[PDB]
Design a protein around this ligand. Sequence first.
Ligand SMILES: CS(=O)(=O)c1ccc(C(=O)Nc2c(C(=O)O)oc3ccc(Cl)cc23)cc1
Ligand SMILES: CS(=O)(=O)c1ccc(C(=O)Nc2c(C(=O)O)oc3ccc(Cl)cc23)cc1
Lengths: 170, 170
Amino acid sequence: FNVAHGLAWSYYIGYLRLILPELQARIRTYNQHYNNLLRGAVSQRLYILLPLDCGVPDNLSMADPNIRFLDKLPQSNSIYELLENGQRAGTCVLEYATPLQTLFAMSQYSQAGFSREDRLEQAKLFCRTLEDILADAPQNNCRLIAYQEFSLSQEVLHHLRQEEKEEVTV
Amino acid sequence: FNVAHGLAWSYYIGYLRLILPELQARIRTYNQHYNNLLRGAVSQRLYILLPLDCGVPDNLSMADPNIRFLDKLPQSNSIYELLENGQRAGTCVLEYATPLQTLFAMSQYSQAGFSREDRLEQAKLFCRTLEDILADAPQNNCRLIAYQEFSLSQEVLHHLRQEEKEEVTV
Ligand SMILES: CS(=O)(=O)c1ccc(C(=O)Nc2c(C(=O)O)oc3ccc(Cl)cc23)cc1
Ligand SMILES: CS(=O)(=O)c1ccc(C(=O)Nc2c(C(=O)O)oc3ccc(Cl)cc23)cc1
């Protein structure tokens, strides 16, 4: 009995599969304006945060004050700026894997018998299953950032700078 | 690997658990008006259709023309009238188990390797898991109507008349 299997398939089938095909076109359109205004570029991939403690807050800034909402990507998703010593070090479309909230709610529902360690195992299994799904899916369109709570903004920036290095080298 | 386990838990945790506690109060409020206007009563339970073929249409009437949308239950869900030879034989809050659509989408996604028989097994497992969950959940608030495609309206009416007989006998 592994709820993560169905949660991952549901998340992909009913959300990621629908959002990812148009994502890059939407970001290219946004970046024509963003490059004109700020001489930079929003990253092209959807970054999905997978906190293995299943703690999804209302506002990303609550998890790290160097992660601040910047703007809405039209047609919607949220663009966040990533700060270093008060400077914009990076920009990306960032959001939590919402099925993790189901795992958290289950661990607080006493009739489930779903312990805290159960939640952790299932959150790990959720990450591995989603990676397997995305690996075969019609991409290079999104990145899973799984972490056990360290700076979350620094971990995102790690990925954003690696994405740019891949962009310009291959 | 059984996607139905996580689909059922997700459906309960993120939807049924939220809707069921207030349902009866909402229907009692509606029925004060409905009894005044039509001298009858809407049934008190949420009826969840579980077509084992995972065929969830846009309009319930497409599945059976004796099932017609009647009105919105405020605060929302849809109230349907059940017809027999053109007469209102019953009234209830009726809706499909939407996770079944995830099963259907998976069977049409060739990289899943999720065959038609896989879909059937998982849809059955989804019904049994949901029943187990509801059995322990804090109720008598909803009824699962699983069926393999016969009149769907007659099957719903079967349940509605059994509910009323239970209401007046115990
Ligand atoms: C149909 S689409 O391809 O998904 C699509 C995707 C992105 C955008 C978009 O960024 N618009 C922007 C508008 C506007 O629209 O007035 O003003 C802007 C000012 C600054 C920036 Cl940085 C962007 C915009 C528009 C359409
Ligand atoms: C806050 S609540 O308990 O969820 C709640 C639940 C149900 C209703 C409700 O049926 N209203 C109705 C109103 C109105 O509201 O004007 O007119 C009506 C005419 C006919 C019927 Cl048959 C019902 C209503 C209202 C509140």
